[PDB]
Symmetry: C2
Subunit: 247 residues, 2 copies
């Protein structure tokens, strides 16, 4: 009893035309009532995407936001503006911000605090690199990453956490569901100790690697994979296959 | 040439409601004929804002964008998606991005090139800090910032440059119109050594300092300040009088 959650990170992808299509396709599909989908298009299409959604199961979120609501912060996205057009989620700490935009763990910590504070949900991204994986420093990083927000955030009833196998992206290594089962279970235990087994038992831990149409079922029987944070496949029709990979 | 340009950068501020009132005011205002006005809302509101302007003189721009149109850059803004939505400009290099997100000179130059590729125009920001000003290295700071862009783009038909005296912000220090004239004259004398005087005499150099309703009027008769990159004045009734100042 953890509601299956499916998130779709469009990344720097979409157009009014393609998004329309993407959303019109949900709206229109058979999707369980008891699944939680959140689509996260560029900030440029947030208002627009909202307009378009008609199924109770889906919401939209932003792919980043700052740690202040307003002020002199040219080029950022605010959680106030994201709630203003009806978005309900924010993705924080994605590997692409961590690497390319060198957001540190305290940055994300602060960003998470602030957003949960303003009433928006947070999809928090953790995971290690190849270098880091090869030195078997995987549990280290991930608890280090989680520890920084644990410092600021005491509640977590509105956080979903997604693990991203960064070592498995463009490296030529592949993550199996067994790899994922393992790491999530582990992650869970860690959080059980900091938060209590009740709070940890209800928290969703999303698998964040290459999950797609063909795969998604592969992970239907892994008890600690509560859903997915999909990349490329979210901009495609296989997206709906994912949403139904359980039944 | 040198048609007066007035960009209003809203920074992280606005709601659907308030961007409606500022546009409406703009729609009904009796502001001059050859005047270029660009409003710069939060990404969240570009579509919407475009939808409301009905005035040949006013256009819209974004506050920052990546150096790629699409891909795996979660959280970023794309010049192509800014285009799809109908905005025409992007501010690149603002002191707030150069500082808190530390966009170095080369990133800026890279993003200027690109956006031009794609067809949007750029409001390129440059400015020295105080410390740099104290060392009397304003001219070297500004040249160095501009050269990075000269390196990559040789046609600035589409670039207006914004001069921000970051050293007059917060500091207790104040920039005069005469200050402005001096500097602009100097960055103009310098882009001519490199872009030929014709190109230079056609380049609009804006004052991105604290320009408001009440002092906008003091820069008239400053021959090298072709306009303004306004700030908080932007979200208020007096943006209009800034607009009508050259009159």
């Amino acid at each position: 009893a953890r509601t299956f959650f499916v998130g779709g990170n469009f990344k720097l992808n979409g157009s009014k035309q393609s998004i329309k299509e993407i959303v019109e396709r949900l709206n229109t599909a058979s999707i369980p009532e008891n699944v939680e989908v959140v689509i996260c298009p560029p900030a440029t299409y947030l208002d627009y995407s909202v307009s378009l959604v008609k199924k109770p199961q889906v919401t939209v979120g932003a792919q980043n936001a700052y740690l202040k609501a307003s002020g002199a912060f040219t080029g950022e996205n605010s959680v106030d503006q994201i709630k203003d057009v009806g978005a309900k989620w924010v993705i924080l700490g994605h590997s692409e911000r961590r690497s390319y935009f060198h957001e540190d763990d305290k940055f994300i910590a602060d960003k998470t605090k602030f957003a949960l504070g303003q009433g928006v949900g947070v999809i928090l991204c953790i995971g290690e690199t190849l270098e880091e994986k090869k030195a078997g420093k995987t549990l280290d990083v991930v608890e280090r990453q989680l520890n920084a927000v644990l410092e600021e955030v005491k509640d977590w009833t509105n956080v979903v956490v997604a693990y991203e196998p960064v070592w498995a992206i463009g490296t030529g290594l592949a993550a199996t569901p067994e790899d994922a089962q393992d790491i999530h279970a582990s992650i869970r235990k860690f959080l059980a100790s900091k938060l209590g087994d009740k709070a940890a038992s209800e928290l969703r831990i999303l698998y964040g690697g290459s999950a797609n149409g063909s795969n998604a079922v592969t992970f239907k029987d892994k008890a600690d994979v509560d859903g997915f944070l999909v990349g490329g496949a979210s901009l495609k029709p296989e997206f709906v296959d994912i949403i139904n990979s359980r039944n």
